[PDB]
Structure formats: C-alpha cells, structure tokens
Amino acid sequence: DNGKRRDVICETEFIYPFGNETADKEIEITIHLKADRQVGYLYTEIPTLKYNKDWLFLMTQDDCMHSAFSYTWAAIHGKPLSYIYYCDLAHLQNGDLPPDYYSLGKTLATTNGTGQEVRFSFGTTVAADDDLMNTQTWVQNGYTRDYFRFYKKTMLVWGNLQEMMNYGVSIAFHDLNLPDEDKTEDKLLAQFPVAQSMIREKLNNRTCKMLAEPNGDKNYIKAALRYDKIRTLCAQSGATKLYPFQENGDIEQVVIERAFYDPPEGSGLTNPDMIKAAILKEMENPKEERAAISIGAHNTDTGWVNFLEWLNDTYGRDGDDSMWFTNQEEYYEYYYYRLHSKPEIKQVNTHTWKLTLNLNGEDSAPFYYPSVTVNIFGLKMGDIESIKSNEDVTGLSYGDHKDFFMLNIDCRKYLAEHAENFVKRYEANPTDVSAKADANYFVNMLKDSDKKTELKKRIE
Ligand SMILES: [Co+2]
Question: What are the protein's UniProt keywords (predicted)?
C-alpha cells in the first residue's frame, strides 16, 4: 500500500566493500606509439594537485548533520532538494518528497582534465557511538496533512551515511559519546576504538582515519595522536596552514588548519558570503603562493546550495575548471602518494614505453582513494596508437594538458563491481532519471573493457 505510514530504518542496497580494498597497487601502463611518431625521451611526474588542478578546496561538515545528506550531498549529486525540509534516503527511494521539492537540473562537479565528470567531494563527521543514528524514518507517500516526517533530525541516520559512502564522501571523528567530565585524554583514547568498531560495522568495514577537533578541545587531539588509526586531523587553531605548492614535509598525524568563516554578528552576511570573499582574495595570488581554502561547515541550507552551484559555475565544470574540490582524506592520501611513489617510464622497443608506479598506503588500513594523475613530458595524444593497462588499474582516462600528456589512473579494486551496482539500481528503477545519470557517471569511471561495454549497453 502506497499511502500507508511506514517507519523504517533507512538502508541502501549496496555499499562499496571498503574492508576488501587492496592496500598495495602495482600500476603498469603500456604505451604503443604510431610508426612516424617515435619519440626520443619521456619523463614523468605526479602533479601537485590531482587532475592538474590549480588550487585546492577542502570541505568537512561537522556535527553529523542531517543537512550533510539533505542539502550538501543532495545538491552535489543531482538529487531532489528542499528549501526548508530534510529528506532521508528512504524518502528518495520511495518518491515521498516534501511539498517544496526542486532540483538544480545538474550535478556539481569539476572535470578530471581528460573529459570526465568529477563530482565535488567532502567529508562529514560521524556520531557513531550515539544511538540517535539509529532513528527511524517515517515514509508515507501522498500524505499531506502534515510534513513532520521531513523535519530536521538531530543527526544523520546510518542509512543516509551508508549511501553517501557510495559516492566517495569521507568520514571523520568529532565528539565522542562520553559524559563531559569523562572527556579526559585517556578516556577519549579508550573510546576511539569503540566508535571505530561501530563505523566498521555500519560502513562495510571502512576504517575512519581523521579527527575534526570539537569546540577547541585539545584533549581530543592529544588522545587522537595516541590512536594510530587516525592519520590526519583538522582544527581552527593549533594547526598548520596548508600551502599545497609549498608543503614539503610529512603530514602524517599533522593537524591541518580549517576555518568556518563565521560572519560578523548582526552583519547580515552568511558563512558562504565569507568563504566566497576569501576565495576571491586568494585567487589574486599565483597558484604556487595560494593557501588551500580549507573549510568547515555546520548546518548547510539553501544559501550553501547556491554557493556550491557558484563554485561549479565559476571554478568547476561550468567555469574555469581550476579547482580540486575534495575531502581532507582524499587529499591526504594523494599527498602521501606524491611523496612516496616514484613513477618511472622505460622504453621497451622503438615504439613502446612502459609506465610503472606503486601506490602503497599506510599500514593502519587500506587507503580508500587510490587514484593519481601522472604527467608524461615529451608525449602527445596524437603520438599514441594504443594504451593498455594491468589488472590493478580499474579506471583510466588520458589526454593532452598544456604542452604535455596526462593520465588519470584509478586503482580502486572493486570499481567495476561498484559501477555495476549502480547499473542494477537503474535497471530496478528505470524511470528514475537521476539513477540513470548515476549509472552513466560510475560506468564512465571504468577503463575500456568488455565489462565497461556490457554496462554501457545496459544503460543506453
Ligand atoms: Co562540532
């Protein structure tokens, strides 16, 4: 019965198998050249920012907020939006939508520099040791007597966060669920693995490796530095301001500076107003001198939706495409690869070159964003007869950039199976335009293969 009230635990039908992700990748890409395009010398580098972007935007949304799903994630991913209400996953799955719902008509994204969409990425904190994540959702198609089922919840329900994981959204610790008087360094340290166990239980064995400091409470940083699963941290003070083109050291266990850009009291300005102003000032400097725009957010709203669209229209896919909009975990992993991986290219014969690179994350858990960009100097797309890759490469796109050649290499072990899960979702909901768009987006991440061809045929 469509009109009957149901109170359900939000659930998604698949989650990327984070626990199974391989920690070590061995990339081997073979480049075969056209006969009259024999080149004499090639050399390679991993660029400062993925996709050869010019500058970095980092976003972490605190307090495990309902709006991280209903506003932030929904706006990025082309989902139904509301001006005053807060959808849960089960509302979207059932088509039980609030009375003011609308859509932007597009996703919010950059390109990867080689012709594919890269949707904006961000992280949310998680209140994994808080039973309020187990709250149910009221679903009732066609019910208009009230809209209480769409009111803001105190925090995300697990199903919302589980679905966000399928789109690369990151996670971070924040407050832990202890009495205020028990928030000592030692007691917080003991509670981190308790929260971690729930994260792994619910997020298909993903391990959280980030702390967003709560409310200037340094006991959280001191405790987190003794819990070796946490590799990256952020705070407003007692941190390091990130300059992506200048930073030279290890950032293992480093507190990266992140600002909320609160507006002056009574000024009528919003946080997005303040961030926009900071971005404009920063872009006046040469890219090598720019700090990262590293931001925190609390509740997101219509103004934040419009700000995300402004970023898309100005520095993303519909603007100058200069920005890398990501979460701190993906950036941390990329910086680690740039520091420790050493791409090499060797001539195999007169017309064949072999590019090799190892991606090895830290010993605590598999890195979850095992993708890099490699530039080849001395080569152009027009020289190339064919490109082949080994099994560890699951996504591969490439093309000219400025006067050189770039490859975007994705090594997520279960990427093809993940794309097929989105295809199956579309096949089960073939009238859902957003489901078909998601299927095309994920299938387009895959390297050329029989499986990619199969999946493309299923979503024509
Ligand atoms: Co907070």
Answer: Metal-binding, Zinc
Q: What is the resolution of this structure in A?
A: 1.4
**Whole-angstrom distance, CA of residue 460 vs CA of residue 451:** 14
Q: What are phi and psi of 360, to 5 degrees?
A: -130, 115
Q: Is 91 annotated as a binding residue?
A: no
Q: What is the 236 CA–ligand 1 centroid distance (Å)?
A: 12
Question: Ligand 1 mean position to 233 CA, how many Å?
Answer: 14
Solved with = X-ray
Long-range contacts (CB closer than 8 Å, 24 or more residues apart) made by 84-88: 85/147, 85/150, 85/151, 86/150, 86/151, 86/152, 86/153, 87/150, 88/10, 88/137, 88/153, 88/157, 88/159, 88/160
Count of H-run helices and E-run strands, the chain: 12, 20
State yes or no: 351 annotated in a binding site: no
d(CA 300, CA 303): 8
- Tell me which residue of 63, 189, 202, 175 sits closest to 124, measured CA to CA: 63
Cα dist. 321→128, 250, 314 in Å? 36, 28, 8
- Could you tell me whether strands 6-8 and 344-349 are parallel, antiparallel, or unpaired per DSSP bridges? unpaired
Of 369, 276, 309, the residue nearest 75 (C-alpha):
309
The Cα–Cα gap between 203 and 45 comes to 34
Give the DSSP letter string of 156-192: --HHHHHHHHTTT-EEEB---SS-GGG--HHHHHHHH
What letters, b where the CB count within 10 A reaches 16 and e where it falls short, cover 111-146? ebbbebbbbbbbbbbbbbbbeebebebbbbeeeeee
Work out whether strand 404-410 and strand 371-377 pair parallel, antiparallel, or are unpaired. antiparallel
Centre of ligand 1 to C-alpha 156, Å, is: 14
Distance CA 317, CA 308 (A): 12
